[PDB]
């Protein structure tokens, strides 16, 4: 598939301050490079505040707390198509993909 870094919703090395400027409505999301740590982050606006979920990488899979996917785009598209919460604890759901400012 199309590599992660070419996805319209992959923003690379943007800091948290920029995430808060780019996400506007609940369920707006982007994926970015880690800032204080090296793993990818799925950042999602929920009730006015960004929530930051580290995407775990292991055994050739990517996951949050559920299924393992062979790529991050597949994880994202699954979350969007099922509308399942990213975690049971959070209740956060993806609704729409925020494009990279560039």
């Amino acid at each position: 598939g199309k590599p992660l870094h070419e996805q319209l919703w992959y923003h690379g090395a943007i800091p948290r301050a920029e995430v808060a400027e780019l996400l506007v409505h609940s369920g707006d999301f982007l994926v970015r490079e880690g800032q204080s740590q090296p793993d990818y982050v799925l950042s999602v606006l929920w009730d006015g505040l960004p929530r930051h979920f580290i995407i775990q990488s292991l055994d050739n899979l990517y996951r949050l707390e559920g299924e393992g996917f062979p790529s991050i785009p597949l994880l994202i598209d699954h979350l969007l198509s099922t509308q399942q919460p990213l975690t049971k604890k959070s209740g956060v759901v993806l609704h729409r993909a925020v494009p990279k400012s560039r």
Partner: peptide, 6 residues
């Protein structure tokens, strides 16, 4: 920085 418990 705070991250979601996952």
């Amino acid at each position: 920085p705070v991250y979601e418990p996952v």
